[PDB]
Amino acid sequence: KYGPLGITNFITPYDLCILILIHAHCSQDNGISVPTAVFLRLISPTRPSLEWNPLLKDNSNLRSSSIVPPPVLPILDNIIRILLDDKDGNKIALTLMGYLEAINGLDSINRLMMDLEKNCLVNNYRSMKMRTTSTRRQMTRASFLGTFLSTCIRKYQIGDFEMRETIWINLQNFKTVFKHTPLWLRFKDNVHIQKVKNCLLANDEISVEDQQMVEFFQHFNNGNDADSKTMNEENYGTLISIQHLQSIVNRQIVNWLDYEEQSGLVFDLLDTLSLNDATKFPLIFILKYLEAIKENSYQTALDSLHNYFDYKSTGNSQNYFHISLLSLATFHSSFNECDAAINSFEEATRIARENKDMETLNLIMIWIINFIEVHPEYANRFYITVEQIIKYLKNSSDVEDANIFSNAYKFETLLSMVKESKTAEVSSSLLKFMAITLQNVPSQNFDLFQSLVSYEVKFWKELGYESISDVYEKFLSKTSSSSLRNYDSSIINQDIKVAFKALEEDDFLKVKQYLLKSESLELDYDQKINLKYLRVKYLVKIGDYDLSMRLINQYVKECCEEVADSNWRFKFEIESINVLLLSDVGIRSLPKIIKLIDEYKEIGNPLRCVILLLKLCEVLIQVGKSMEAECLISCNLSTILEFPFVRKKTDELLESLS
Amino acid sequence: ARALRDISLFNDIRKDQNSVKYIPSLSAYNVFNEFPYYPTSASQLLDGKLDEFLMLSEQYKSRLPKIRKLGWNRFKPIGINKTMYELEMLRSRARA
Amino acid sequence: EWQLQINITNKIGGINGDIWLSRDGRSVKWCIEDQCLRQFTYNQKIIKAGYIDFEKTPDCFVVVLSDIAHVYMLKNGGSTTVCFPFQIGNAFWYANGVILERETSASKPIEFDLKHKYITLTDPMAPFGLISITNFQLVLFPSDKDKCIAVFLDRNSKVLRFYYSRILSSSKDIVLTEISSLKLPDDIIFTRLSSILSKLKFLSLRFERREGLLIFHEPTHFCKIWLIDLLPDVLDSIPFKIYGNSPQNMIRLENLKLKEPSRIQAMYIHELLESCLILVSEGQNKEEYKACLYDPFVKITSPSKNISEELTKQNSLPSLQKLFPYPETSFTKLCFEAVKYITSPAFNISFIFLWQSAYSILLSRANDDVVGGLKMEHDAFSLVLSLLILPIPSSSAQEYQEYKEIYERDLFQHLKQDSEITSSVLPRIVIGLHLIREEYSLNVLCRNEHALLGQFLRFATAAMGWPDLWQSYYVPKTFFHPLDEPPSITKSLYSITENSSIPLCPFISFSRLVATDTQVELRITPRSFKILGLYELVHSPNFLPDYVLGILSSFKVDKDELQTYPLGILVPLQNILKILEDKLSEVRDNLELLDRADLQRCSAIINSIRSDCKVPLAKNRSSKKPSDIYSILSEIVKSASGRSLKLNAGLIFSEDKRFTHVV
Amino acid sequence: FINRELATPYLDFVKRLCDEAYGYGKLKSELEALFLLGEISCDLEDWLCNSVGEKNFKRWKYLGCEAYQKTVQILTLIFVPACERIIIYVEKLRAILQAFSIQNKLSYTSDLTAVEVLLKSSQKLLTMTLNSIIGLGRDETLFEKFFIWFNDRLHEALDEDYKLKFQFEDDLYFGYDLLSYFDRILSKKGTEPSSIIDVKL
Amino acid sequence: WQVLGECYSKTGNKVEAIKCYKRSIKASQTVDQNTSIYYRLAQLYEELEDLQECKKFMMKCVDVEELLEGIVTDETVKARLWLAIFEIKAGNYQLAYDYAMGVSSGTSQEIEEARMLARECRRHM
Incomplete structure (x- = not known):
């Protein structure tokens, strides 16, 4: 399931999987309603923006009141394992599996997307009640799925043909990875796949002539390996959006700081960035920093911190220079440097004054x-x-x-x-x-x-x-x-x-x-x-x-x-x-x-x-005047038994007096 | 972020006792025209961080009608000394 | 896998720390025992790891790359980095700096430079220095400040060059002058410079003013030691340095007095024992290795026969270093030091050997009876001397069987065959221990072991037949004894006293029978010397209670030292200070020996003025209704959103109504 | 007091406004459809307009906030100070009896097993009390996120021109907590009066 | 190297800044470039409460002006004014008189400071 990782502002193959699921649910032809927990695990990580300051603030809002499952990596193997668990999840799992088999071309991708915008998604509720003649469930824009599908629709009309080809070249790469997996062998034949595939493959308008050569276009591009393959630029194994990467990273660092996760997969994938997405995603640097402190590496901690605070300050318009020192000050105090941390902190005060902003002074004082x-x-x-x-x-x-x-x-x-x-x-x-x-x-x-x-x-x-x-x-x-x-x-x-x-x-x-x-x-x-x-x-x-x-x-x-x-x-x-x-x-x-x-x-x-x-009492008994010591201890014996850890000493002295 | 007033107790006691400039980033600067992008609304600035997807979404939305709005203004066919921008303005007055 | 380093730092005695290298020269971990401290990784090859000082009294850890040195402040401060004019082959630590040798050849042509390849630096910021040599790879240098001998080997010549290097500070920083030379054996064949240097092993040893260099080669079983005597007159002689002329007598080359010197596995310096003793490892079979101890200067060696197979590895050195026992507690340390000052080094080093053996035997015998503590070493100390003085029993005796394991040891046989040492040295030891017990009698906090000495001393007298006066000195009511009367602090103190019935009597301390300066005697019995000094000065006919403060200041006695005395001496002196608590109001220096803050604070203020430093302000300990839960909470939220001068004014002017009238 | 004045009045308002008007099981599924899909049935749109309306919605928020924010106050400000005081008195109670068991040296002794049970039980209460305070802390979080979203739906049903101010983009797990509120407020266990706190225990 | 000292100087690491500039002085190929370093380096000693030590560097900076056939640069102007001020406290009015006249070709405030000092030393000369 491993592969090179690259941030994409287009429809990731993971994204279509949700679009696969939502199509079955809204179509209501198969009577298959995907459980709500499934959607809330899939769409929610794609929901944008969380933010996480490096230090100076710990889980002030990141902690969810209800424990949530970990976000899912964009591999068919991981996605299928969610649906697979249910006794009837096979029926839901095969529904996804069949659709991915039916989608054999870029046009077929477009058929899905045109279907949803024209029929499924609808501007507002006031037209729900007039559309009682629809055989499919209709979606409101403001709803949880509605706002997501709107973004997905936007990301498809946003690019030229150059992006659409990358979708299909990657999906076939993405689909074929699951093919050489043990689980696919367990699902080699399931008869229901053919039934669901033929449901949508119908109305092909040709089966005798074009289909003979339609296969030829598909196969020739594909790595039939009969001859030398057509040479093409290296393609990424996995595509994720920035927001999806934010969720997986935040969960990983929080889990690291204090339903099973895949640490190896996440870490391996995060090591293949083209160094440009790292600029678009500065949080990858700090993920090394938290790792760096774990093994107590000094210089490797430092450069990462400096790395993180250079890309973050430029990206965000508000002045965060007054925040960089404090984190560096924290870092020095983390290694007991202390005195060096002191010097670091003083210039933070001067910077706060020039910004002339009151709210940051509370933050600087609280750190003191x-x-x-x-x-x-x-x-x-x-x-x-x-x-x-x-x-x-x-x-x-x-x-x-x-x-x-x-x-x-x-x-x-x-x-x-x-x-x-x-x-x-x-x-x-x-x-x-x-x-x-x-x-x-x-x-x-x-x-x-x-x-x-x-x-x-x-x-x-x-x-x-x-x-x-x-x-x-x-x-x-x-x-x-x-x-x-x-x-x-x-x-x-x-x-x-x-x-x-x-x-x-x-x-x-x-x-x-x-x-x-x-x-x-x-x-x-x-x-x-x-x-x-x-x-x-x-x-x-x-x-x-x-x-x-x-x-x-x-x-x-x-x-x-x-x-x-x-x-x-x-x-x-x-x-x-x-x-x-x-x-x-x-x-x-x-x-x-x-x-x-x-x-x-x-x-x-x-x-x-x-x-x-x-x-x-003890000094008075080593003098030879234990007589009055006994008198004093007798009057105060009531109030000295209230404390537990002194009882052992208190008891021991008693046998000495006898 | 309860501000000490979202707390019901202290809010109750208080009643009784009473009795952002923007600067461009690198990704904002593009290669063709030296003018940097200026975000239209604060929604496009994500906690002060310019979301690259929203930026390019507006850019696509601006260019799409630009092909359609081409023939407006300067372009004039020969044999018609009057460009099409005023073909519709006279057309508007025709019915109105 | 991680590799440990043998010698990393000059700390005139050693430092508690470890250095770990990865399988490649790319990572350095300064782990202490099991906690990974500051860890450094680099792309280039790592040469060596420091923690040495840089003549400015720093505590900085330094790592040397091929051409770049990183210096990280550990005690205080950040990090620094320095460059170098050219590539560096290796770097060697020395007192206040590093010695850097140029990379010789790389490819397979082999070419090298010889005019100048050594760089001296004190601190990172200052410019480098150049060595000086007067009438050739550096295999070993005297990293420790105490030792001052450097060894040079030139490849083709296959000969050694011994120098007397002295460090010059505020360019020539180090100067070397040849003394002697050694010829390598023909069988020794060396072929990657570190790998060439790996086969040969060199160690630096020094005791008093004699120092020795141990040369070892495992493949050829070659082991020799070069000794020198650092005579202050010979070394300071001008012809000795420049001309390099040396007399034949102090130069000497000798082998080891071991049973099988050709079967030595490896050796190390005893870190815990600061003296010349060196660890020696020998193996009689592939699964057993015997460990023994040997002294270079004095031919005494220790039969230990300690078996350790897996501990021969380098990365297991600290466990091996911790294998042999030394008295860690704070009682027998003085006893050993007294033995060192009163016995020959030959007798001394053999004594630790016997003590360590006996200590080990008691561990095996004692099956964790109750606790195990100070009594352990004391029993070991007791039985060693008892065996020294008690005649060896017959082999059939039960006492022979229980302590047979000590009897057959060669040192014990030698330490009993030697008639002279048993005749005279043992009473000296007994007298010294008696003085230690006398000293402990002046410190009331340690009466327990004070008594513990008593039983043994009584036993010592019984074994050696001293006059009944000495024996009766412990009861409430054939060697020759030098002193006919036991020396006592109290008896002499009562002698030097007004209205003293007893006649004048001196304490006859051991400062004369030790044949050494009083500075040595001072650090052993400071209480005895101090009290003798105080009452020698206080009981003068012309003594006045004012001088006692300067007296107390001069003898380095503090409040804590004052509060620990077995009545007696404490009582009058405390009363004397009580007298000074009354009439002293003029600020007459050394106020810290009193308990009044005002005078010492005023003195501190004055001294700051004289110099032109801690103006510790006194916090006002102010101190009533506790009220209720709600009232407190209302108070804090309500608070959430001249008087002294006028109060003084009502006191500055008083006794009338004039000020109100004028206002 | 909280059972009679804070817990019960809030729950009866919920039960009358929900069970007596629309029903529980139908509401829970249909609300999820509203949340995920925005599908409002004819009957539910009646429920927002006629049953709930604007008048009860402010009452619902007013009842709910006091049902939690006042509940934590009495737990932190009454329960915490009292439990510690009981512990202190119990501890002093034990010491007194132990001493006169020795000082008097009277042949007959009174067993202390009664005291230690109270000490353990009293210790159990304080630990149990703190858990609720932590739990009610979470409940306030879930409560607020529900109504901020519920406000948008209600006014949209009654305005057809409402401009949605709040955005779901603000939080990622805004779906989970919003759903988490429903099961707590709409379930067989929630129907019981002990839904807010385990009053029976 | 010059920049590092300024950072050190601006951060209250004066003990380090002394050595930093001392490294800068060796790396400079030409002596004339050292004129600015000398003045500020001398100031760092003044704040280390040892006026005697700063005199030696103060001698060098002014002597550079003579070695450069009278360069008459701005950072020697402040040097000569301070040197003459200290010499008045030393009681050597004659040795302070020549310093004032040599700096009489500086700024408007520089010349008047030395001219008044020139009258002060000529009074006790």
Whole structure:
């Protein structure tokens, strides 16, 4: 079924197949009505125009609410397999098969097309009711099939005889490809084919003289191979319109990003473009780019991106130069270049000002924090602080925003969490973002919906209620990851959870091997901290604390200046507390534990309050004053069983007291 | 693209609280006449991208009557000093 | 299929990374272990892959094509590309640059140039340089900065030329002077330049100031090593360089002291072990290959008899490199380093050999009892020294059977036959380990293994019959010992103290019995040296609590270093700082050792002024009704669509009603 | 409330306007013919003009939008906050009983199997609640695309001079969602009052 | 090579732009073409807060004018005006006086800037 591919603005052989089907359905002589699902799989990809920005926008409208079958490749083998499935589909399948056999000439093609325009297609409904004398079903222009057939009619009267010959030379090539196929052998003889073929072949007006030599014209052109064939220019094996190519490509990249498709056929066919249709179809370049990132090829990613943004900008009259840099900026942030991405972004701001268009500034601002969300360590380097944006976007407008406010509040929630604000405000801020996101369609805005889950899971986990987190985590998508953050980040993130479990099950060999990968990998900041946090926990289990103690303090000291992450500061502080008290000297930590207790009492996070209580209890029992420790733990035992993961520590301490 | 107003809730609250230049592309430029194609309507610009099929559709539609509208104006037969463009204008006044 | 590369980069010790080449010189993948990092494909043939530095402290990965070099910034930055005056045959890495040799011949006529075929470049942007040679294909160059010997072979002559190349920076960039020469064996016949170079193998080794070059040829089983001693006086001598005259003594050529040197499969440098030790692979049958270890400088070799058949392949090198064990934890590393500083290299290298063997045996013996951790190496460390000091039991003894596998090893036999080393070196090891335990006693965070040392040290005393004072030093209540009294940090510290009942006593550290500068002693026991220094200065009669800050700054002690002390030393010094928390208000430098932000911030402001750098603004932690769901949503949609100065004014002027009257 | 005020009134309007006027099975096939072919029977053209008309069409849109846009509000703004609160109280409820099982050390113990059932069931509700919100998000999409196309057909039947503003060219899968609405609104399962949400469950 | 530095200069990569122009200087066949490079290259040092370093390139650009029998080009006019300004801050009025008179054949604003400076240095001469 493979062959050279070329974009054609004329009637592709695939197109006639629908025209074959619609003829049988409207004729109503055979009583064969093609099922509606068949048409909606065939015509709909040919419906024009979808558009798909390279990055900076993911499936904002491409996702169909109902799952649709993949678009069909223009090969008789694939087309027939759709009709073939039904028990009576053989009858429908043979109807198509017979018509393709009856159509043996360019004139016969014209007979089909003249028939539809004169009788089947009709300008408007008001003439339906007057045409009750028609033995065939009549079509309205505005209908689903009507608008399609109008386009097909237009594409036939649009060209000279030069295009009509290409239709027939290609169709016979297209028809004969199916002939040397195993399925055609299964349908070598079906008697019904002759019946349907003779239905339309009738009224030939000659059977004795012209038919003797009519065959001679057909056969001589055809490759009878008795002699050397008539030499003709190389002809393409498959012809598709631009719009049909758009559907197959968009489905392929979406399927790749996260009823069976034919990846090999699509990829092979897309590799035979004459390099001119590639100009007419710039999206072929980016299809390599998405493939390029998968194997982590740097230069091969770059040239493709530059390739895509040169043909797109010229084709579209609106200035998209202000969009090219951001995609390139995303690409650099994808390879952790970071600093180079920074320079890329600044000149995007200047370009936006010259265009003097307001709507693009919202797009450039929204990209800022999305970048800083991945790399919070770069907040100081931007010319605008994060808080300025939130204040700006909160009062941006009251209309023509839709998703901006949903984006606006989530950034405040993240900042509010990191700034360790009081839980009352954080709950309210997340409330705003939750209400606005769910109010509109959440399925269509798949990116933000996932981000909501991540924040909520994180938020409730910090409060210590895994029961709530357990419900939400089932909605978190794995391996989906997000844009502008690498491509193997999901693999790394999954691996880290493995290491933590391995640490719990005392699999020191596996975790040890993973830390070796740590020092030479390019990792995101959030990933970096986890491994940085992973190492200190591992060193505690081994027993060496001189190295860890010098290591933990460096981490927390740099966890307060470079990034003002209070949550990660807390987790590191308590590890140091564990290190001290484990070495029989936790008394040094008494100043440190107390200053956090009253500090978090004001905050009101119960999980924080309880964990320090256990540490306070543990230090008091290694002193020899376990008497009062028992008294304190007795009064607070009720409120400390609410948190699951501390129960194991809480239970274990109980037998110690006995 | 709900614009925050297609949302029933926030739209309700707002009521209570109240109380493009075109530039040619390469494919637009043709080989015969150096004037580039100018699209007739914004429908022919597909998200700003000039659809090549619609462009050539209008081009065919313009040229098709051009063969028919040939004999108008300048061409004059001999023995008739009066071209056919005014043969129908007098013909129009004849019945009217 | 992908091919791995042996030496790609100069990183004065090595780098964690891999380079993969396709079946053709058209793709390069910088995968780490199993994750394909930056991958580069090219139409032309790929010559070599870099990751070397370019004298500007970059971390850039470089790939060389036939005539074009691509240099990709990995640490920071984008990409650069440079051209070349002519075609390049091969390129060799060297400290801060690359050496490029011209393509010799292509067709089948064979013609070549000899006047100048080598190009030196430091960084891509700067112009190239020309080599300098004084009284011929480059087979190997000293890529590592530490080694400084280059080897040249000329085809027709079939002789070697050894030079002493030194790099010149800010055109002549490198200069080479011949020292000696070696004649190839007649049986060695070489015939596609890389294929010619493939058969011969060369390795660069260096220890201390001795370096060795290993020359190997598998088809002819030819293996020789060229050694040189880098005497600072000899090298710096002007006649030595220009004239090339060399004395006969330091030049020496020797073979390997192996059982069957003619049956060597291949060899590699131990990446994990930075010393001269080299991997050696031997095969007695087509399905079994025995691996052993050998030291070039010291004739000591390791009987390992490690069997590995499929690991002999090149692309499986990292697995082979990871096959042999080394102490990875952070406790026995100091123990090994102390042994290195107190024992001969001959005894040293044999000790790792025995330790690695014992470590392997314990792995086989220990069937994953509970966890496996620091106790592992400590037990290995313990049993090795016990076997060294304990007399070998009779073959019928049960203890003989359990550790028989270590007894028959030649090194253990030699390491016990040697009367002198067992007579004197072992007590030195015991004393050094005792000092390590003393040092650990100053760091309260590591008391566990501190005790672990104790049992062994007690065992060591029992084996060697030291006076009961040493043995009683561990209980709460025939070699010759040099020290009659155990050295203790605490006893000496209490000696240097006011109102000290005990008389004056020095610590008699090992800095004198190591016969090396205190810089070496510093990196081993920094805590012991520091505390000794502090209380030597603090307890002076003319000491005042102001100088302690400069003292603390000068001894590189930080807050974390301060918080880890077994009471004692910590208590007064903390009180001393507490005293300085009161009377210090004049900004007197080195404020980071305190905990007051204002003084350090003011000092930071002042220092920025003096230089003419982080004006970290303090975020206002502001802080009440929680309200209801609807009210919040109404608030945000409603918001969707001087005061300080006046507040100051009410405070700037006060105590009267004058300002309102005048307004 | 939503069953009585939002779900039922919308469905009865649909049932009376469709089943009582034309019938379901005949409508579904004939509408598909209208969508694919534009064939309007004599009886259906009566149904658009007399049965539906302009007056009910605006009512239909007004009923439908509230039937979805208000439905999601009560699920997101009432159901989500309550389920989490139940979880918290249940979790605290479990902790209290466990402690006095130990602090009191009283010989008789009360089993906690009742609590954990509520915790699991409560957890099930929130997961079930979110699925509906996602589903109603899709339903709003299908609902709107139906009436924007239905508007063109209705006015065309009543004007014979209507200028079609909307174009099907805007979307490729505009056929699928439009068809997808019909089966949801016209089927035996759809005839049941639980068509909007699974009220019974 | 000249173009690359301008891009680097316009993107705040001044550390790179120095080496870029330095490569451009070697590739030029004739010294006279280097007159424009010298002035802008000197400016790049001025923004790198080291006035002493830029003096050496500043010497060369003006000296090209003498080596070209008094070319009197525009980008040396701005050179001589800046050199004389800095020399006043150096206290060497005599060494600044000859610079002003040599640039007295430039633009309308150039001649008045040097003429006033010529009076300033002749006052302290």
